[PDB]
Design a protein around this ligand. Structure first.
Ligand SMILES: N#Cc1c(-c2ccc3ccn(Cc4ccc(CN5CCOCC5)cc4)c3c2)n[nH]c1N
Ligand SMILES: N#Cc1c(-c2ccc3ccn(Cc4ccc(CN5CCOCC5)cc4)c3c2)n[nH]c1N
Lengths: 215, 202
């Protein structure tokens, strides 16, 4: 019904698409509020450091636990669901989105470099729900794009917020003939049992060809 | 070296973004009557509107060549994975067609598949409102590659924090023992979160 979302990142500008797809009606009606915070507001040094060399060697830097611990303490309560995009996470699916759609406070912690010191989430887990998730089997530069996906998948399940087993088959609209390609005639037959069956066969077929693992 | 064109009725979403340029094009600049919609009701009936192939056809005609790789995000596409990103990292020209509503008339990709290579892909098993978020993900996964197991936990300073210690092996400086500990963490994490990567059931 109602939901607050805090996003924490060192590139707040990458979250612009969210401000751009949120309807004013939902914000006015207080269905949703989305804040973005610059992690660097919680650094301790004049150089505004967020990253440091990894214990045990290895390429790339790791984000500092001290800075992240500062930010999460301020933003989180014991009622928060802390969401941490990560290339080593549990799969984010539609089931996940559905379950999170009923939460009242999401915090999304977007890391960069090789990620965030593990102690941050371990510590968080001793007093709030914490979920390490990945949005798909590919590698990104950080968690900001993942957050865009997660926020969208979830918010569109919250009634009136974004204004909206087998693979879906093909869709068709006007004109009935275009570049020598006619809309499949069954779709114009006015026989709605035949149409439903024809769509089901397309669906089964496409699913076999594209996602045989759903079977 | 690579060029990416994204075509969308929501160009303001793509807002933020040398050997590579990325152009965002407004599909509506191609409409035939400014007083008409890009979407219409679906043949056969159903919920939601479908995007007409007419406007899409004019846009892609202009923007594509026969060598163009045309990418269409769809919730019914082939899985987009790291293998896909690697394959696309060598292309010279990608055009990403972002749909909205219930999506694009199927004849667009079917007609395009007669003159160029078309790829219907999905970035995940979850539902979006249109192809634009997917295009961002796809662009990010592909560009970072232009010239097995899940990773375990990483740590940096301080060595103790809120009374949590860094795993002492990592302070040992024994490269072989550290490698071993990390493989162990990674296998453990993989079995727990993604058992399918090792051929088990989910
Ligand atoms: N959700 C989600 C994601 C993410 C994601 C999410 C969050 C962060 C924070 C930093 N990064 C970058 C990053 C990339 C790769 C690696 C590991 N490799 C690097 C080199 O050495 C070892 C192997 C680590 C860190 C992130 C990536 N990617 N793909 C998804 N589906
Ligand atoms: N990549 C990727 C994606 C997309 C994606 C990509 C492109 C477009 C263009 C429009 N949409 C919205 C859309 C949502 C749902 C449905 C199914 N419907 C069936 C009948 O009832 C309503 C629902 C169809 C269209 C898109 C979604 N979603 N998830 C991914 N991994």
């Amino acid at each position: 019904g109602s939901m607050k979302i805090d996003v924490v990142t060192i590139f707040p500008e990458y979250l612009q698409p969210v401000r751009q797809s949120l309807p004013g009606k939902a914000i006015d009606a207080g269905l949703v509020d989305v804040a973005v915070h610059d992690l660097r507001r919680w650094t301790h040094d004049v150089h505004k450091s967020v990253d440091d060399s990894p214990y045990g060697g290895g390429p790339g830097m790791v984000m500092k636990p001290t800075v992240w611990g500062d930010a999460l303490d301020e933003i989180c309560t014991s009622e928060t669901l802390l969401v941490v995009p990560t290339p080593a996470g549990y799969p984010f699916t539609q089931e996940t989105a559905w379950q999170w759609s009923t939460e009242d406070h999401l915090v999304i912690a977007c890391g960069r470099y090789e990620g965030i010191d593990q102690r941050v989430a371990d510590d968080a887990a001793t007093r709030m729900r914490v979920r390490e998730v990945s949005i798909g089997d590919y590698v990104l530069n950080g968690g900001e794009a993942a957050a865009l996906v997660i926020i969208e998948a979830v918010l569109r399940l919250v009634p009136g917020v974004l204004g909206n087993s087998l693979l879906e088959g093909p869709s068709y609209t006007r004109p009935p003939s275009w570049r020598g390609m006619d809309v499949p005639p069954v779709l114009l037959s006015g026989d709605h049992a035949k149409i439903a069956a024809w769509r089901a066969e397309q669906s089964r077929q496409r699913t076999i060809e594209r996602r045989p693992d759903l079977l």
